[PDB]
Swiss-Prot record:
Gene that produces this protein: EDF1
Main location: cytoplasm
Organism lineage: Eukaryota, Metazoa, Chordata, Craniata, Vertebrata
Protein localization: Cytoplasm; Nucleus
Annotated consequence of substituting S48D: Loss of interaction with CALM
Consequence the record notes for mutating S24A: No effect on CALM-binding
Induction: Down-regulated by HIV-1 Tat or phorbol ester (TPA) treatment in endothelial cells (at mRNA and protein levels).
Function statement: Transcriptional coactivator stimulating NR5A1 and ligand-dependent NR1H3/LXRA and PPARG transcriptional activities. Enhances the DNA-binding activity of ATF1, ATF2, CREB1 and NR5A1. Regulates nitric oxid synthase activity probably by sequestering calmodulin in the cytoplasm. May function in endothelial cells differentiation, hormone-induced cardiomyocytes hypertrophy and lipid metabolism.
Subunit record text: Interacts with TBP and the transcription factor IID (TFIID) complex, NR5A2, NR1H3 and PPARG. Interaction with TBP is regulated by phosphorylation. Binds NR5A1, ATF1, FOS and JUN via their conserved basic region. Binding to calmodulin is regulated by calcium and phosphorylation of the IQ motif.
Record note on what altering S24D does: Loss of interaction with CALM and higher affinity for TBP. Same effect
Name assigned to this protein: Endothelial differentiation-related factor 1
Organism: Homo sapiens
Entire-sequence positions represented here: 71 to 148 of 148
Length: 91
């Protein structure tokens, strides 16, 4: 399944934490889609913040990288995992 099309846009904190937790584990977007039994399409859209983020799929993605995907506590680990940095957003 074709995906891509990245050329300077914003990324929601979900999309950032997705990418960051992926890359922390070398997991491609297609590896992620596999881990959550989804399309690699929606992962590529989640990264920008252009899919609809639903707590069901967000919950699967938490398992995927071992970090939280809601709250300003996003990128905190689930139970056990390494530290990560934080930062603001805008809108």
């Amino acid at each position: 399944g074709s995906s891509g099309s990245s050329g300077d846009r914003v990324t929601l904190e979900v999309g950032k934490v997705i990418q960051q937790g992926r890359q922390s584990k070398g997991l491609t977007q297609k590896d992620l889609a596999t881990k959550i039994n989804e399309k690699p399409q929606v992962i590529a859209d989640y990264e920008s913040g252009r899919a609809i983020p639903n707590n069901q799929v967000l919950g699967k993605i938490e398992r995927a990288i071992g970090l939280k995907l809601r709250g300003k506590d996003i990128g905190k680990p689930i139970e056990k995992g390494p530290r990560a940095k934080s930062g603001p957003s805008s809108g």
